[PDB]
Structure formats: structure tokens, C-alpha cells
């Protein structure tokens, strides 16, 4: 499952903000944990 980060162009660093992105919403997400 991917949030859909590779939109943009993902070769100069949209791939590692794709991670970063990935990351950002990963630590947002799990605001509740449970």
C-alpha cells in the first residue's frame, strides 16, 4: 500500500521526500497509537 507519493517526479528527491512524505504522514497517523 503506498499513499501515492510518487506524483510528482521522484528522481531529483521527490523519492526521498517520498519517504519523508511516507515518514511525516507515518508519524502524523499514529497521533492516536491505539
Excluded: C, F, M, W
Excluded at 5 to 18: F, H, M, T, V
Amino acid at each position: 500500500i503506498k499513499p501515492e507519493a510518487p506524483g510528482e517526479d521522484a528522481s531529483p528527491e521527490e523519492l526521498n521526500r517520498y519517504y519523508a512524505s511516507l515518514r511525516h504522514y507515518l508519524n502524523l497517523v499514529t497521533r492516536q497509537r491505539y
